[PDB]
Design a protein around this ligand. Structure first.
Ligand SMILES: CCCCCCCCCCCCCCCCCC(=O)OC[C@H](COP(=O)([O-])OCC(O)COP(=O)([O-])OC[C@@H](COC(=O)CCCCCCCCCCCCCCCCC)OC(=O)CCCCCCCCCCCCCCCCC)OC(=O)CCCCCCCCCCCCCCCCC
Ligand code: BCL
Ligand SMILES: CC[C@H]1c2cc3[nH]c4c(c3C)C(=O)[C@H](C(=O)OC)c4c3nc(cc4[nH]c(cc(n2)[C@@H]1C)c(C(C)=O)c4C)[C@@H](C)[C@@H]3CCC(=O)OC/C=C(\C)CCC[C@H](C)CCC[C@H](C)CCCC(C)C
Ligand SMILES: CC[C@H]1c2cc3[nH]c4c(c3C)C(=O)[C@H](C(=O)OC)c4c3nc(cc4[nH]c(cc(n2)[C@@H]1C)c(C(C)=O)c4C)[C@@H](C)[C@@H]3CCC(=O)OC/C=C(\C)CCC[C@H](C)CCC[C@H](C)CCCC(C)C
Ligand SMILES: CCCCCCCCCCCCCCCCCCCC(=O)O[C@H](COC(=O)CCCCCCCCCCCCCC)COP(=O)(O)OCCN
Ligand SMILES: COC(C)(C)C/C=C/C(C)=C/C=C/C(C)=C/C=C/C(C)=C/C=C/C=C(C)/C=C/C=C(\C)CC/C=C(\C)CCC=C(C)C
Ligand SMILES: COC(C)(C)C/C=C/C(C)=C/C=C/C(C)=C/C=C/C(C)=C/C=C/C=C(C)/C=C/C=C(\C)CC/C=C(\C)CCC=C(C)C
Ligand SMILES: COC(C)(C)C/C=C/C(C)=C/C=C/C(C)=C/C=C/C(C)=C/C=C/C=C(C)/C=C/C=C(\C)CC/C=C(\C)CCC=C(C)C
Ligand SMILES: COC(C)(C)C/C=C/C(C)=C/C=C/C(C)=C/C=C/C(C)=C/C=C/C=C(C)/C=C/C=C(\C)CC/C=C(\C)CCC=C(C)C
Ligand SMILES: COC(C)(C)C/C=C/C(C)=C/C=C/C(C)=C/C=C/C(C)=C/C=C\C=C(C)\C=C\C=C(/C)CC/C=C(\C)CCC=C(C)C
Ligand SMILES: CCCCCCCCCCCCO[C@@H]1O[C@H](CO)[C@@H](O[C@H]2O[C@H](CO)[C@@H](O)[C@H](O)[C@H]2O)[C@H](O)[C@H]1O
Ligand SMILES: CCCCCCCCCCCCO[C@@H]1O[C@H](CO)[C@@H](O[C@H]2O[C@H](CO)[C@@H](O)[C@H](O)[C@H]2O)[C@H](O)[C@H]1O
Ligand SMILES: [Fe+3]
Lengths: 281, 306, 248, 54, 43, 45, 54, 45, 54, 43, 54, 43, 54, 43
């Protein structure tokens, strides 16, 4: 029921709202006020998705889809069978994510640690809201937001990207991809380095962080450090998501053309705009 | 209003750290480079020393030849015009030979041979760097986790440039050397094979890239939140569990219902990261060689309405 | 072009995806079991083994060999909190908070908890003390930022609690770890760098009030700190966030 | 049904009441929305059709 | 046995009150279902 | 309804009132929006 | 058969009761949803087609 | 040990199982009533 | 054959029982779904055919 | 060896109870199979 | 042949037993799915064709 | 030898009972295979 | 070849046994699926054609 | 060479029993290959 060290930490306090009414644990989970909120929102959303599966006439989990209302419904409600179930699932998911972050804040306060984790999750929630709320609001239709299906929100990504040509040419998209790839690379390097220090070759003494720094200075001539690597991982992930949200917020609202054409401003700079040869000239 | 531990607020510098001389030939190791206060605001300020052995110099010179070959081809495409070179830098491309040459090496330099030369240089550089990571791990007596994690990315790279072109029967299938060029190659690869979104292994690879972002955010945030207990010194927490490790474990235990340890979270990390390129290489290998229309395959396997 | 299916729609892609599902199930099992080397077996709130231990069995033990003759650690092994936890449960049933019996910050429970670590200093790759005062740290100096030597230290109650007299440094990582603060009583305390807010004119400590720097645990040797001592100090300072709230 | 009272010697009411409230409200919302989704029992739409409000 | 700390008489009294609330809820539910059945029968 | 007073032997009212106020207000907002969503009651045209 | 009570000497009653309560609720809602899916047994649909209320 | 992972004794286990079986039989009887009612109303066999 | 009690000298009864419960329920659900997906053994559809419920 | 810590007699008693449960389950399963087969055989 | 008992001198019986159980279950499920995916041997469809079920 | 810490007697008992379970499984499998090959042979 | 036993002097038997077992099983399923892919060896369809099953 | 620690005598019986298993496996494999080659040869 508890870890071998857990008991000395399960003290009252740290609650944002309430204090005794919802200050306890169910199994391993801490149940706050936001715990109750999150559980209700999640259960309502999941069973609504099951209901929409019943309405759609398919019991394939991969084929289940909850489309938003068509474009002619604007920013208004829709019949449950047509577009309203998506809106209820959307408000449920938004509430679930926000209450999950708040429950994390309560857990942080009880444990006496920093609030970095809910902050990063807030970045993720903001990207989600950009995709479901902010961008469709600026484009005046819930139909622009993605459907809630496993293989049908991919169709949303495909259609939305191809509306603007090759979506690779969105510059903020390029930056966000660079951050994502760099973050995966850094995660692999960090896991590998820690495991290699903690698991030396064969019956060898466990390595110190000096060995980690020496390994990476030998390899690439720099070592960001034990604290620096965790700072870097957090910042890479958050910057990736930030530039993802930035790239989507400007698409369809500030930019409407093919994204490749955006690069013409570099090739048309007057000093070299009309020099023959190369590719564009 | 509170210190978030994102940037160090006071930098301290001592004598240059030469590192641990487990089995390292101190002759190959260079001298300690400069100290960067700009880098010191975020991590270590010290640059170097860097080890330069047989594989190091082999990989460095081979990669220099690859980079220089691509650059000289780009200069040729610019008509030796520096203004044109800067204007069209992202538009230049060293393209693989046309499909009618198949896998043959008898393609002209302007039409694929120079691509083969640069590809050989890149192949040598990357494999020598892999051996270099393995040997640097071995010299310090550490485990080889970095080498195998690198081997996963090497496998995706090899599938993209070497293995799938051979299976498909032509060098034209491989990726051109260019900034916008390889983006065009990626988009065209998706279009030719019918919406690579419906490749299951592309989907898993994206699951694991998203999961790597999620997990590194979680882990970095967790370690920063318990850095007030010396939590970033993870090896000592593995060897002698402090209150940082317990508080991190209990945070995720009370949030998710399960947690990791200071050592096993890094197993989660390394596997989440390597699965990206492992699954991606499997998917790219399947594309064209087994499935040429992933949307129709999807429809036949659920995943899409008939 | 392969694409022959052995049955139904089962081509090589189907074989690969099902093989990956099997591999992923095995890998998730492996990762979860490897992450059970600490904190298990599960215990009741009275410390006895619980009836429910979970779907995943405990892994085989493995031994780490410590780098400076410091010993050998086998996990999973026997687990016992080698300290008198001062808490009493507020409910007969499980899953409820345990309230402190006395001063929680003093007793070291909740956010003020510390772990009975080894009472030896952390040793770098050379076997020396990893964390040592800047005075004993040869050639170590402040490179950037405001050097906080002689800055007044303000608590969460907005009153000066002492003056910084030294910076304790991690030698190999070459980063600041602790500020040594001399109080109004002439005695010294250590404060983690992560919990101080160095400013233009003062070092602010939001965690503690002015009448709490005396309660910070001390170090027996004035030129070194052991893992246990720094665990106690950091736990105390962090618990100040919850337990010094009444003051501010 | 005589000894069912002993369930309160198994579960503390402070958690069972929260669980029961959550469950009953959730079941209520699910059933009401299921009825509102089918046009047959959508009371608002039945009223719109009866009173020619469309 | 003996988890929550309530004694047998306390459990008896609590369950009597709880069953009273359950029956109040069920009776109001019965009246609601009767009204719906006489308004739009589902059978 | 006599014995229901024992409910305040179980839960602290100083928090229960806040929780219940949140609940009832959110129920009100849900019902308002539900009537808005149907075209035969949307009063905000 | 008589000795089945010993199941409680191996499994904690609180855990088992929560688990089987969730299981029975989910099973019941899944069966009811399956029925609502099939046209031949959707009681709401059968009723609406019975009283010409479309 | 099968002498009790939960710490219950034979008497407590027997009484708890008796009450649980009573509840299970009640639930099963209500279920059989529902099944017979629906089957008479619209059989599936 | 009758000497299969010794498995309990090897396998922990709690994990065995929970794993077996999960396995039995999942196997039953899978078999019921295989039948439901078969038109010649979907009991609901066979009943609809025999009693003209469409 | 014996890893569960059970005694031989405890294993015997547990096995007897488990086999009783298994035989009851298999008996109800056999009844279901006979009913379905006579209703709609698959052979 | 008779000496095969040394297999239990090398491998933990628990690991072998659980691995074998998973392997046998997966192999049986795969073989049953293969036979169910070939109309020549899909006993459900064969019995459907035998008695004019469809 | 001496990898799982089992002795010859308990290893032999374990092997015998495992072989008994294997032969029970094999006998049922052979019965099923004979029944199928009679009903719809594949050779 | 008589002294081949000395291979167990260098190789750990557990690793060799597990690796060889998984390798042989994967090889066997690969060959069986290769045969099933070729209609010249799909024994199921060979029997289907021979006995006029479809 | 204590690479595995086997006493040069355990390895003998280990190799003998592994060879017994290998010969049983290969003999059944040869029987299967003969049966399939007779059924329809691949050459
Ligand atoms: C393949 C070539 C082998 C590469 C790995 C060799 C190795 O054993 O590394 C040990 C390596 C280093 O050991 P060491 O430094 O010598 O040991 C130091 C100490 O002894 C301490 O070492 P340690 O104890 O820390 O290391 C132990 C580690 C070492 O274990 C491994 O490395 C296993 C490697 C698995 C490769 C998986 C291949 C992908 C299959 C997907 C399905 C295909 C469809 O154990 C595991 O990680 C176990 C992982 C789970 C394995 C079982 C998963 C379930 C199996 C499913 C069936 C059963 C259910 O340990 C690790 O680093 C593990 C993490 C990194 C794994 C990277 C995997 C890379 C895969 C190759 C790249 C792609 C090539 C082409 C693949 C695509 C073809 C289709
Ligand atoms: C229109 C384009 C298509 C598409 C076409 C493709 C194609 C084609 C591929 C992918 C691949 C991937 N796609 Mg896709 N993809 C699409 C949409 C997406 C979306 C999205 C939200 O829309 C996302 C998140 C992704 C994400 C992904 C990744 C999961 C995956 C790349 C893994 C990787 O890290 O490779 C990057 C890592 C490598 C390539 C290996 C690098 C290792 C080598 C050794 C590096 C050496 C460095 C070199 C020597 C230079 C040295 C530099 C100096 C030393 C500094 N795709 C759409 C549908 N996608 C790849 C894949 O895995 O397929 C399944 C791939 O091949
Ligand atoms: C910002 C950096 C990255 C990040 C960070 C991050 N994510 C986080 C956290 C952090 C720091 C947490 O602390 C939190 C956590 O608890 O992690 C275990 C979390 C988390 N990130 C998660 C997932 C997740 N993160 C993603 C992304 C990212 N997370 C970023 C890349 C993705 C992507 C890219 O797809 C996913 C899927 C969860 C595991 C968890 C948050 C759990 C949560 O919110 O719990 C409450 C809600 C539920 C239990 C479910 C509610 C369900 C709804 C009611 C119905 C369904 C609605 C949904 C819109 C349907 C979708 C349909 C299709 C689109 C599939
Ligand atoms: C698990 C999959 C992820 C991953 C993992 C991964 N990558 C890795 C590793 C790992 C585990 C390494 O160990 C290895 C490494 O060393 O990392 C730092 C590496 C690596 N991944 C790299 C890149 C990389 N990884 C990528 C992706 C990924 N890596 C995945 C997301 C990508 C992408 C997304 O495209 C890239 C570009 C490198 C940093 C490194 C491999 C380095 C290498 O092969 O170097 C060879 C050299 C060249 C071909 C280029 C030469 C360029 C110069 C001309 C050389 C000469 C310079 C000159 C001498 C300078 C002189 C200076 C003075 C004049 C001052
Ligand atoms: C690298 C690959 C990474 C892939 C990541 C994505 C895929 C999902 C991975 C899920 C891993 C779950 C691991 C086990 C967790 C678990 O079940 O914990 C229980 C709670 O479960 C839960 O809360 C269930 C997990 C959440 C839902 C997952 C769907 C509590 O029990 P325990 O596992 O702590 O017990 C251990 C024995 N005592
Ligand atoms: C997709 O496939 C479908 C769904 C169509 C078909 C498949 C169906 C399947 C696979 C169905 C499986 C069904 C199963 C396995 C059902 C099992 C049901 C069981 C075991 C139900 C048991 C219920 C027991 C109950 C409800 C007992 C309740 C007891 C009480 C309420 C009394 C409270 C208990 C007390 C007080 C304990 C005594 C306490 C003390 C202190 C003595
Ligand atoms: C896709 O392929 C398909 C599905 C079409 C065909 C493939 C089918 C396959 C692969 C089927 C495999 C089926 C198998 C292996 C089924 C196994 C079934 C078993 C073993 C069922 C066992 C049931 C046992 C039960 C229900 C026992 C219940 C026991 C109790 C309720 C009493 C427990 C209480 C105890 C033991 C108290 C004792 C405690 C003390 C302290 C004495
Ligand atoms: C795609 O290719 C297809 C699938 C079409 C064809 C490929 C087929 C292939 C590759 C098939 C491979 C088949 C194999 C290798 C099958 C092997 C099956 C085996 C070895 C099954 C063994 C079963 C063993 C059983 C069921 C043993 C049960 C034993 C017990 C229940 C005994 C209990 C143990 C006790 C009591 C130990 C306690 C004793 C003491 C002293 C504590
Ligand atoms: C893609 O290419 C294709 C597939 C088309 C063609 C390529 C084919 C290739 C490359 C085939 C490669 C075949 C190879 C290399 C086969 C190697 C086979 C070997 C090494 C077999 C050795 C087997 C040994 C066995 C099976 C031992 C079996 C033991 C038993 C059956 C009884 C169990 C007893 C044991 C394991 C010993 C017990 C005693 C102790 C002390 C544990
Ligand atoms: C002023 O500028 C100077 C000239 C001084 C330097 C400038 C250099 C410039 C402008 C460099 C630009 C470099 C660029 C744009 C590089 C881009 C590289 C990219 C995006 C590569 C992307 C993918 C590459 C892949 C996937 C390569 C895969 C290759 C392999 C897997 C190995 C290939 C090996 C093969 C095909 C066989 C080779 C063996 C023989 C015997 C030919
Ligand atoms: C690292 C892998 C090494 C093994 C590679 C195996 C493949 C060897 C080269 C591919 C075979 C080329 O096969 C040849 O292709 C040419 C086109 O160029 C075609 O020529 C007609 C035919 O298809 C064939 O004669
Ligand atoms: C999730 C991991 C566990 C997977 C199951 C364990 C066994 C692992 C190997 C399974 C391989 C066979 O898996 C099985 O293949 C057949 C091949 O047609 C699939 O295909 C079958 O169902 C699909 C979907 O209804 C039909 O379109 C298809 O005509 C039919 O043959 C099955 O849907 C799949 O279940
Ligand atoms: Fe880390």
């Amino acid at each position: 029921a508890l870890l071998s060290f857990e008991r000395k930490y399960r003290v009252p306090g740290g609650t944002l709202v309430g204090g005794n009414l919802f200050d306890f644990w169910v199994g391993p989970f801490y149940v706050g006020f936001f715990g109750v909120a999150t559980f209700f929102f999640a259960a309502l959303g999941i069973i609504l998705i099951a209901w929409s599966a019943v309405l759609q006439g398919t019991w394939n989990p991969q084929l289940i889809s909850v489309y938003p209302p068509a474009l002619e419904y604007g920013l208004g409600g829709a019949p449950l069978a047509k577009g309203g179930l998506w809106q209820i699932i959307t408000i449920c998911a938004t509430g679930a994510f926000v209450s999950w972050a708040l429950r994390e804040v309560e857990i942080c306060r009880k444990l006496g640690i920093g609030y970095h984790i809910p902050f990063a999750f807030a970045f993720a929630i903001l990207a989600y809201l950009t995709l479901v709320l902010f961008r469709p609001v600026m484009m005046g239709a819930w139909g622009y937001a993605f459907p809630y299906g496993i293989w049908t929100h991919l169709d949303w990504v495909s259609n939305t990207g191809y509306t603007y040509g090759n979506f690779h040419y969105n510059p903020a998209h390029m930056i966000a991809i660079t951050f994502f790839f760099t973050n995966a690379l850094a995660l692999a390097l960090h896991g590998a380095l820690v495991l290699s220090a903690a698991n030396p070759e064969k019956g060898k003494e466990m390595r110190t962080p000096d060995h980690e720094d020496t390994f990476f200075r030998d390899l690439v001539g720099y070592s960001i450090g034990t604290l620096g690597i965790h700072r870097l991982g957090l910042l890479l992930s958050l910057s990736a998501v930030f530039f993802s949200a930035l790239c989507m917020i400007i698409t369809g609202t500030i930019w409407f053309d093919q994204w490749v054409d955006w690069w013409q401003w570099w090739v048309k700079l007057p000093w070299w705009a009309n020099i023959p040869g190369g590719i564009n000239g | 209003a509170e210190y978030q531990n994102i940037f160090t607020q006071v930098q301290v510098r001592g004598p240059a750290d030469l590192g641990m001389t487990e089995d390292v030939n101190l002759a190959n190791r260079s001298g300690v480079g400069p100290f960067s206060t700009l880098l010191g605001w975020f991590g270590n300020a010290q640059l170097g020393p860097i080890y330069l052995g047989s594989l190091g110099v082999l990989s460095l010179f081979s990669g220099l030849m690859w980079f220089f070959t691509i650059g000289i081809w780009f200069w040729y495409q610019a008509g030796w015009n520096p203004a044109v070179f800067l204007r069209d830098l992202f538009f230049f491309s060293l393209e693989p030979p046309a499909p009618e040459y198949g896998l043959s090496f008898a393609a002209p330099l302007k039409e694929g041979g120079l691509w083969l030369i640069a590809s050989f240089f890149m192949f040598v550089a990357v494999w020598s760097w892999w051996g270099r990571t393995y040997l640097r791990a071995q010299a310090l007596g550490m485990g080889k986790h970095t080498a195998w994690a690198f081997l996963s990315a090497i496998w995706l790279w090899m599938v993209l440039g070497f293995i799938r072109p051979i299976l498909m029967g032509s060098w034209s299938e491989a990726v051109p050397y260019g900034i916008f060029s390889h983006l065009d190659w990626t988009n065209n690869f998706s279009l030719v094979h019918g919406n690579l979104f419906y490749n299951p292994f592309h989907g898993l690879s994206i699951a694991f890239l998203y999961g790597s972002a999620l997990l590194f955010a979680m882990h970095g945030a967790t370690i920063l939140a318990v850095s007030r207990f010396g939590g970033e010194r993870e090896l000592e927490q593995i060897a002698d569990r402090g209150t940082a490790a317990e508080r991190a474990a209990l945070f995720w235990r009370w949030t998710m219902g399960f947690n990791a340890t200071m050592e096993g979270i890094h197993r989660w990390a390394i596997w989440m990261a390597v699965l990206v390129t492992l699954t991606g290489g499997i998917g790219i290998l399947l594309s064209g060689t087994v499935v040429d229309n992933w949307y129709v395959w999807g429809q036949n396997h659920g995943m899409a309405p008939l | 072009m392969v694409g022959v299916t052995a049955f139904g729609n089962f081509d090589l892609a189907s074989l690969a995806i099902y093989s990956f599902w099997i591999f992923l199930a095995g890998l998730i099992y492996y990762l979860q079991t490897e992450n059970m080397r600490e904190g298990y077996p599960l215990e009741n709130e009275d410390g006895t083994p619980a009836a429910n231990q979970g779907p995943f069995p405990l892994p085989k033990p493995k031994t780490f060999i410590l780098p400076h003759g410091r010993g050998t650690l086998t996990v999973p092994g026997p687990e016992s909190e080698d300290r008198p936890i001062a808490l009493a449960r507020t409910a007969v049933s499980e899953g409820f908070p345990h309230a402190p019996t006395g001063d929680p910050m003093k007793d070291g429970v909740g956010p003020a908890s510390w772990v009975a670590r080894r009472d030896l200093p952390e040793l770098d790759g050379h076997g020396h003390n990893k964390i040592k005062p800047m005075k004993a740290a040869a050639g170590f100096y402040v490179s950037a930022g405001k050097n906080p030597i002689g800055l007044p230290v303000r608590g969460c109650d907005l009153e000066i609690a002492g003056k910084v007299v030294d910076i304790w440094v991690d030698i190999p990582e070459q980063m600041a770890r602790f500020l040594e603060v001399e109080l109004k009583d002439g005695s010294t305390r250590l404060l983690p760098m992560q919990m101080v807010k160095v400013q233009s004119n003062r070092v602010h400590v939001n965690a503690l009030s002015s009448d709490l720097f005396a309660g910070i645990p001390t170090i027996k040797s004035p030129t070194e700190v052991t893992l246990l001592e720094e665990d106690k100090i950091c736990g105390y300072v962090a618990g100040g966030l919850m337990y010094a709230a009444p003051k501010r | 049904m005589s000894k069912f009272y002993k369930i309160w010697m198994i579960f503390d009411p402070r958690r069972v009441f929260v669980a029961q409230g959550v469950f009953l409200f959730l079941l209520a919302v699910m059933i009401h929305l299921i009825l509102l989704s089918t046009p047959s029992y959508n009371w608002l739409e039945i009223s719109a059709a009866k009173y020619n409000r469309v | 046995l003996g988890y929550t700390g309530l004694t047998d008489e306390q459990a008896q009294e609590l369950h009597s009150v709880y069953m009273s609330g359950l029956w109040l809820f069920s009776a109001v539910a019965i009246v609601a279902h009767l009204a719906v059945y006489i308004w739009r029968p589902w059978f």
